[PDB]
Amino acid sequence: PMDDEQVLRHLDQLVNDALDFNSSELSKQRSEALKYYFGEPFGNERPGKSGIVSRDVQETVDWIMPSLMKVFTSGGQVVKYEPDTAEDVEQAEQETEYVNYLFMRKNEGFKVMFDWFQDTLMMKTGVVKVYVEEVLKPTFIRKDKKKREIKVLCVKPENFLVDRLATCIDDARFLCHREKYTVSDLRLLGVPEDVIEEANREVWASECYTLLDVDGDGISELRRILYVGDYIISNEPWDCRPFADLNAYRIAHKFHGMSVYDKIRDIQEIRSVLMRNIMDNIYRTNQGRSVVLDGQVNLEDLLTNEAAGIVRVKSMNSITPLETPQLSGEVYGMLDRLEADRGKRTGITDRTRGLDQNTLHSNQAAMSVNQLMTAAEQQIDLIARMFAETGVKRLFQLLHDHAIKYQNQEEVFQLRGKWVAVNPANWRERSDLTVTVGIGNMNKDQQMLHLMRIWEMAQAVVGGGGLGVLVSEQNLYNILKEVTENAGYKDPDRFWTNPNSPEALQAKAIREQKE
């Protein structure tokens, strides 16, 4: 009760414990993963012997990346909102388009997404941070004054201290983010002095989000602490934790899920060892192994690698050359099946290429149905599913961070017009169904089913029954509209609109009726 200084030492103890445990365990694991990625020697390499390291996780990561980038960083259809039925286009489409228009094309593009995916595929966990800024440009043309802008950035997960007893983002009792916050930022804040650590002195700082009870009452809500160097700090009650902490594999109820390294390190080790064994055997066979006596053949055949062929001994005549057998094709088959198993584990794409020109393509129905059921239930779809379900958290965080107070800014969603974004609703609910393992039909198959099926259905309806009783121009416009949705030229490039529009009244009620 009424704590002002013991909170500092308590936070210092928590930060020190987090540093020790996180550093030891996670730093060891991530250093191993990074060394494996860059083909660093494992330590078992022998002097005077080849240190061949077969990079195996590099290709796996570089082939996981394009699928996720194609499925996510293409359009603003990744997440919907699905509000109450009557009021949907008023805000849900507007808010979804706003958050898409500000996450993309407004916040470093998808570079944050690329770094986030590397963090979640490499350091076993990828987390970003959403913060706010203030634009006060005194350009009296574009006088964008009092612009409480919102930015999202990756946090370099080595500086993402958190207790182990969380197992979720909104379950930790303490989150620490280590930043620099150089002397310029401190001077802007207003502190008069410096700490132990030219105007810029590369000082270090930290930010703490934790729930405590400092008001002499029960446990209060989250508090934000600008604990820099045990000095002037900025304490303030907070509302929500701005982090997203992807894990990419969803292990059982522990916070940090495993990464690609944690399941392909054995494959990389086996491949590197077997490659080294093969090339060592080849080098030994070319060089040759022989036994020589002491006092004779002292020249050791001049390392036996001289391009002369003359050996010379002394006076003896025997020499014992031993034979090292050559490896057969079974080792070649071992390499082939090892690569096949490495692919089958996560990168189930075979050779990641389609330059088989002799091969043909044939379809029986439903487009070889769904390309053989999405290449037999690709794991990539599940990975994208959980990535979307965890980016729901960051999208909701951005929605709140704008709904509190952002600006009077507009959008370009197929038409001008968007009011101030400080009075939407949170809706406390999001949906990412249109991406992945759910209904979530991939655009190429969704458009196939839609276009083909619904088109013959509509043509049969029009020919047989009539557009009056059954599907009308209003609905046919829909079918064409989602056809263009799959085509990408939705509203302005091909209007086709005719819901009930002034030009449509003359088009329908005059020419189509009085003809």
Add this chain to the structure above:
Amino acid sequence: PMDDEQVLRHLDQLVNDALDFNSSELSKQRSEALKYYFGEPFGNERPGKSGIVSRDVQETVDWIMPSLMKVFTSGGQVVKYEPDTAEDVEQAEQETEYVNYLFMRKNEGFKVMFDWFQDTLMMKTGVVKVYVEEVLKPTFIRKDKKKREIKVLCVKPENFLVDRLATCIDDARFLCHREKYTVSDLRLLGVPEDVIEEANREVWASECYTLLDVDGDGISELRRILYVGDYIISNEPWDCRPFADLNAYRIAHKFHGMSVYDKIRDIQEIRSVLMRNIMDNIYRTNQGRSVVLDGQVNLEDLLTNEAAGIVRVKSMNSITPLETPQLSGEVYGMLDRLEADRGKRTGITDRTRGLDQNTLHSNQAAMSVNQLMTAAEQQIDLIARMFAETGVKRLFQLLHDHAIKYQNQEEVFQLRGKWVAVNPANWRERSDLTVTVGIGNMNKDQQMLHLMRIWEMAQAVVGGGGLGVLVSEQNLYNILKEVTENAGYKDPDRFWTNPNSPEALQAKAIREQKE
């Protein structure tokens, strides 16, 4: 506060530190990469033995480059602007066409692109510089006076000193560009004397962009310093850093990403060593290995390579010819799989040729499902995506450097007419979606989807329902226009225009109606 000379020594210390660190680390890495590219010996070659070096990164670079040039240096559709909806054609198309028309066909063409791509693929980072000039030709015909012309040039990244704590272009506190700026330029500037270093004395100079506080106040904005030789300098507050600093692989939060060498050096080493072993074994088998005594066979078989067949001994009769086994067929497969893995890493194009005449072609739907999902999610697409997302910064830099003040010059965008380029808006936003991993359908498949799908849809609508209620001639014009978009004959070579034009009124309201 009020610093006029300590800034010189501070900048000198920063430049010296940057020289030391950048030189050591990056010069070592780039020298290794360059030696690997030109097939230089690795240092392990033996005297009297073949120094065969299998050039492996040359073909990889020569395969990466044409795809980049095809996808980028073809048309001005790489980057759009997407402004507020109502005012789009007024400036967005105009400014986009202007920046394309001045970058291409006006600034050395794409030779800057070629050098920039070499810099980003060889030295692990490619960066260009954007500056302004002043042409004052007194030709009184084409009296082009006050030509504040913007020029972009590659900077030979060995002269791109920058601190390591940036991890981004707009994050470094100090950028140094080393130039020559010969005595002619110094005399033009107005300095009276020379430095330690014929009128031309090949003097050395440097340019510094850094933020400091020299006005006795808080940390100010960026400053440009013409620090040449610790002499008369040109200090001036600046606004933006004109650099683009591609990295081509987007490693985690560090400035310099890896290069092709950094991930194919192991493959090149393995291939060179294994090929050298093969040819050494062949040469040894042809030459032969034999053990001879001392005092007899003094002629060492005349190097055993004489085309005579007569050996001669002395009196000894035995001779011990040892046998070096010939390499089996598994090494052939080892070379095959090594080449296959080298391709699968980055150069996934197999042999980069299509002379498989016995092969055929067949399509089931969606153009062989988008040519097997773009040849199974080509890495080239992701490389182009990041290249465009990084060149967005360069395009914005050009837009700013032109919107400040350039000239009253015009364009040839499908029609004459373009006003002064000093009063556009920056729009603070760019889009490169029409190129790459996003929606970004490559022209050949976008055209297929558009033309085919939309065309049977439109014919079905016209035959069944009628062009009145649904799509009319106005939107059918767009249907044809985006079809002709893919061929290059967009506006004037096939007009078809008929939006609402004086000829269109007679064409439609008279002949098509009163018939």
